[PDB]
Amino acid sequence: PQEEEEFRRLAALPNVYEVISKSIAPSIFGGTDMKKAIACLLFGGSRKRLPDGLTRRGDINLLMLGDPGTAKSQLLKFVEKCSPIGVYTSGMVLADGGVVCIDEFDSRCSVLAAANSVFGRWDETKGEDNIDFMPTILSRFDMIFIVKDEHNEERDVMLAKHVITLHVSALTQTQAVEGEIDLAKLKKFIAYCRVKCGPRLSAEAAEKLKNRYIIMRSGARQHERDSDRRSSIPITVRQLEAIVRIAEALSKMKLQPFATEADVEEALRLFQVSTLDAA
Amino acid sequence: EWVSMAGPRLEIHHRFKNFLRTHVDSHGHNVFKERISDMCKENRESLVVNYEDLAAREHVLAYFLPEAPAELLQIFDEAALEVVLAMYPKYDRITNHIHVRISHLPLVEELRSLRQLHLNQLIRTSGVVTSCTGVLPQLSQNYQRIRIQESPGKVAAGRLPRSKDAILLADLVDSCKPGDEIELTGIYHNNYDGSLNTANGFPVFATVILANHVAKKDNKVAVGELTDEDVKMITSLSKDQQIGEKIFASIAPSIYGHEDIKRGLALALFGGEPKNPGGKHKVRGDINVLLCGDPGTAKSQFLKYIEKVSSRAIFTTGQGASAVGLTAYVQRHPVSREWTLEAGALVLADRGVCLIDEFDKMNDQDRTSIHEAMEQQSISISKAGIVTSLQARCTVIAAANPIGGRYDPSLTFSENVDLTEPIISRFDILCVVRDTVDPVQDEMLARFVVGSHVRHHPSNKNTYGVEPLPQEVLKKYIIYAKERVHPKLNQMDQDKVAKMYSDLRKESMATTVRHIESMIRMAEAHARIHLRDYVIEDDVNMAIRVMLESFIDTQKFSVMRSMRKTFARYLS
Numbered sequence: 001p002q003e004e005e006e007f008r009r010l011a012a013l014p015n016v017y018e019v020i021s022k023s024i025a026p027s028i029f030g031g032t033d034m035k036k037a038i039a040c041l042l043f044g045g046s047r048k049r050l051p052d053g054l055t056r057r058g059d060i061n062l063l064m065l066g067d068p069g070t071a072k073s074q075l076l077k078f079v080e081k082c083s084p085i086g087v088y089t090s091g092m093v094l095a096d097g098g099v100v101c102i103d104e105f106d107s108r109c110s111v112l113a114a115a116n117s118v119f120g121r122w123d124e125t126k127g128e129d130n131i132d133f134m135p136t137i138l139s140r141f142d143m144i145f146i147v148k149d150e151h152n153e154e155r156d157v158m159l160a161k162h163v164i165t166l167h168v169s170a171l172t173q174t175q176a177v178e179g180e181i182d183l184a185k186l187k188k189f190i191a192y193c194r195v196k197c198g199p200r201l202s203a204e205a206a207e208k209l210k211n212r213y214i215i216m217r218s219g220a221r222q223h224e225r226d227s228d229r230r231s232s233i234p235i236t237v238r239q240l241e242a243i244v245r246i247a248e249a250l251s252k253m254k255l256q257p258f259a260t261e262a263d264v265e266e267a268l269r270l271f272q273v274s275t276l277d278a279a
Numbered sequence: 280e281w282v283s284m285a286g287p288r289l290e291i292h293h294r295f296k297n298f299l300r301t302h303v304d305s306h307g308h309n310v311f312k313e314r315i316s317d318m319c320k321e322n323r324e325s326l327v328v329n330y331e332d333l334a335a336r337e338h339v340l341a342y343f344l345p346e347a348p349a350e351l352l353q354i355f356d357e358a359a360l361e362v363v364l365a366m367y368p369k370y371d372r373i374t375n376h377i378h379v380r381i382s383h384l385p386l387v388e389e390l391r392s393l394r395q396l397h398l399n400q401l402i403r404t405s406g407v408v409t410s411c412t413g414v415l416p417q418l419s420q421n422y423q424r425i426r427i428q429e430s431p432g433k434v435a436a437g438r439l440p441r442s443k444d445a446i447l448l449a450d451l452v453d454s455c456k457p458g459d460e461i462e463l464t465g466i467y468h469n470n471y472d473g474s475l476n477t478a479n480g481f482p483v484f485a486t487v488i489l490a491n492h493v494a495k496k497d498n499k500v501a502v503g504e505l506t507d508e509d510v511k512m513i514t515s516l517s518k519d520q521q522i523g524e525k526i527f528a529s530i531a532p533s534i535y536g537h538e539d540i541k542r543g544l545a546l547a548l549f550g551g552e553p554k555n556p557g558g559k560h561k562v563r564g565d566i567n568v569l570l571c572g573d574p575g576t577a578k579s580q581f582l583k584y585i586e587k588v589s590s591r592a593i594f595t596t597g598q599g600a601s602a603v604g605l606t607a608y609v610q611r612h613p614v615s616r617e618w619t620l621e622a623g624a625l626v627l628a629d630r631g632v633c634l635i636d637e638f639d640k641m642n643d644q645d646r647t648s649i650h651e652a653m654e655q656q657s658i659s660i661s662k663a664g665i666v667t668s669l670q671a672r673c674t675v676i677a678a679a680n681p682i683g684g685r686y687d688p689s690l691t692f693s694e695n696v697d698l699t700e701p702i703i704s705r706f707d708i709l710c711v712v713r714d715t716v717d718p719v720q721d722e723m724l725a726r727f728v729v730g731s732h733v734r735h736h737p738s739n740k741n742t743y744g745v746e747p748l749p750q751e752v753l754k755k756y757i758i759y760a761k762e763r764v765h766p767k768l769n770q771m772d773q774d775k776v777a778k779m780y781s782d783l784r785k786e787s788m789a790t791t792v793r794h795i796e797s798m799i800r801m802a803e804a805h806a807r808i809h810l811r812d813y814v815i816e817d818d819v820n821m822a823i824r825v826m827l828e829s830f831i832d833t834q835k836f837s838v839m840r841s842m843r844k845t846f847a848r849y850l851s
């Protein structure tokens with residue numbers, strides 16, 4: 001019962017999103033957007049039934065592509081550890097409402113998938129044809145992220161220093177950097193938020209997302225026509241549903257009964273940065 | 280029978296009480312009061328008493344314990360219970376029965392040495408656990424059934440390892456794991472089984488040991504077994520400035536030349552220090568060596584010598600090693616029919632060394648299970664509803680032959696070997712051996728071979744210029760160095776290694792972190808060779824030299840000359 005008050009106090013802060021994002025794998029350097037996406041995936045959306053009997057997915061599916069050594073398996077292991085229900089596979093029935101991590105990609109379950117480039121390493125000049133998955137199976141994933149080995153001398157120095165600092169200070173002290181939540185506390189908070197309530201969108205946010213979806217579809221059309229080539233990542237109504245789910249999850253994180261325009265804007269920004277850069 | 284007399288029985292009970300409440304150690308401390316206070320603090324259910332002290336004080340008790348184990352042990356348990364009640368009356372609320380554990384039995388016997396004469400007698404045995412059951416309740420209690428085989432290192436070649444059953448009660452339940460080397464003190468009792476009688480056609484009793492004390496066979500016992508003369512000889516060898524030269528020259532006397540391969544194998548044998556920074560990720564302290572060579576270089580001879588030298592060693596062939604054989608597998612017991620785990624070769628190689636011959640013959644499916652044990656030194660078995668984790672801390676030495684039978688210097692090392700890049704990446708040291716027609720080298724080889732043939736006749740039964748060490752002395756030195764030294768890397772210049780790694784990236788993209796980790800554990804092992812608590816930069820220099828020699832040997836001929844010219848600073 002006291003943990004209810006603790007969770008209410010934690011979720012009433014104006015900076016719950018930043019604290020949760022920092023709580024997602026503080027050991028791994030960088031990837032703030034990826035950490036935020038992982039957090040909102042862990043929170044997840046809400047499922048809704050209809051009088052006609054049809055059901056709509058209330059879970060988010062994500063796909064990751066990148067060169068080896070970008071710390072993907074570590075992220076999957078952290079997600080499996082943090083989630084109340086988690087399954088890790090090398091490439092469904094036992095998981096109900098949890099998260100299933102699938103490595104080497106080449107039932108109410110959220111799917112987090114990681115895969116490698118077709119040639120082993122990404123080719124920037126060639127552009128497309130670096131993904132072997134068909135567009136039909138690619139459309140199921142809500143967001144697709146691309147990671148490349150950004151070779152910077154100072155970034156390599158910083159990465160080495162961060163790794164060595166973790167190695168050295170790891171045995172000495174195990175403390176939160178800046179207000180990071182403990183693993184058990186974060187797990188219980190996520191479970192409480194998922195069990196308690198689920199929010200819904202508003203009319204103004206709906207209209208804004210409608211206009212943005214129409215503009216994005218027109219832009220994707222124009223890019224496909226000018227490029228004279230079929231994009232491997234099409235945009236359909238499922239993308240709109242995914243953005244709605246992400247906005248609802250963002251509203252769910254604050255336990256508000258009605259979603260706000262800020263959640264929709266953040267969901268649109270994340271969807272842009274992932275899919276449009278990927279496409 | 281004589282013990283069953285009430286008078287002597289009660290008198291011995293009170294004598295044991297006086298021994299518990301009266302013994303004094305060499306430091307003037309009543310040890311058992313400290314032990315009972317510790318057990319009360321920990322709320323345990325068993326008490327450990329040294330057999331040596333009891334034998335020193337009461338010789339009659341030391342004579343009686345092997346002869347009448349059950350009655351005397353029950354009496355001692357009752358005496359301990361009443362002593363605890365007198366000292367800690369409230370301790371009846373947390374525990375209702377307390378058992379006395381006997382440790383350090385002077386008589387140690389092997390599973391092969393079990394006869395009828397040991398029946399219903401306390402015997403100390405040593406072995407390795409293979410399979411274990413679950414915790415079972417009894418309408419009296421906790422139960423554990425385990426299956427123990429002889430240690431593979433102790434087993435002579437050509438003879439199958441024998442297996443025995445053991446029973447654990449209460450505190451001893453769940454005190455061991457499969458694949459863990461332990462020694463046991465227990466009662467060698469016999470069991471009546473009509474099924475065996477019907478099958479064999481005559482009365483047969485299945486002998487099962489009921490263990491009293493369980494102690495895992497860590498190398499602490501080996502440290503205790505070391506003679507102070509051995510320690511002084513090891514220290515005198517350590518202060519020698521040419522200890523490394525004689526150590527390297529002492530390996531494979533019957534084989535001529537090939538300094539680099541024996542150097543790398545010795546450096547891997549000494550091993551590094553495994554680390555677990557923060558309990559988040561674990562850094563291995565093991566060196567993986569892959570040996571590709573042209574036929575006629577006596578690779579199998581090197582593997583056989585390593586097999587003999589190692590205290591714990593398992594030899595496997597490429598054709599006869601399956602994935603199920605190498606790893607642990609789930610099986611239904613033929614008698615009791617519960618799911619059981621039988622350890623594979625790698626599991627029995629834990630804390631030891633595993634040798635793979637003709638690794639290029641491995642099936643890819645069999646290769647898949649290898650990477651997990653290579654990277655994490657642990658195996659997670661999820662089969663038949665059983666999920667278990669087992670330690671796989673082993674040093675792996677793999678042998679392979681190039682495709683076509685000859686190594687092509689005009690191709691990359693990856694192309695000449697039919698193995699995937701991750702498998703090669705898991706390896707830390709790579710050594711390629713070729714065959715060249717040199718008349719002077721031919722003269723040296725012929726002379727050395729004929730001399731060795733003359734020396735080792737049953738009727739009749741160096742490059743560095745240093746005398747090789749005796750095999751037993753080398754083995755003792757290896758044990759002591761493995762079990763005593765823990766180096767510290769407090770005097771490393773990070774700028775030099777950073778510049779070297781930047782150059783390595785520059786010259787590798789023109790043609791990783793784990794290479795740095797391998798070099799670090801290599802320097803740790805080299806420091807352990809000299810028995811130094813702290814690492815001197817000479818270890819780092821030698822590790823850099825050997826690693827750079829290994830790396831350039833894996834490149835094409837058109838670029839290795841330029842690589843040598845660029846890195847002539849460190850090779851000189």
Ligand SMILES: Nc1ncnc2c1ncn2[C@@H]1O[C@H](COP(=O)(O)OP(=O)(O)OP(O)(O)=S)[C@@H](O)[C@H]1O
Pocket residue numbers: 533534535573574575576577578579580724728
């Ligand atoms: N450098 C050497 N010095 C002394 N004896 C050697 C040497 N190289 C080979 N021999 C002898 O040659 C014998 C046969 O060599 P092998 O070990 O069969 O060859 P290999 O290099 O292992 O290639 P494979 O595995 O047989 S195809 C050994 O048992 C040694 O007695």
Ligand SMILES: [Mg+2]
Pocket residue numbers: 577578579580
């Ligand atoms: Mg051979």
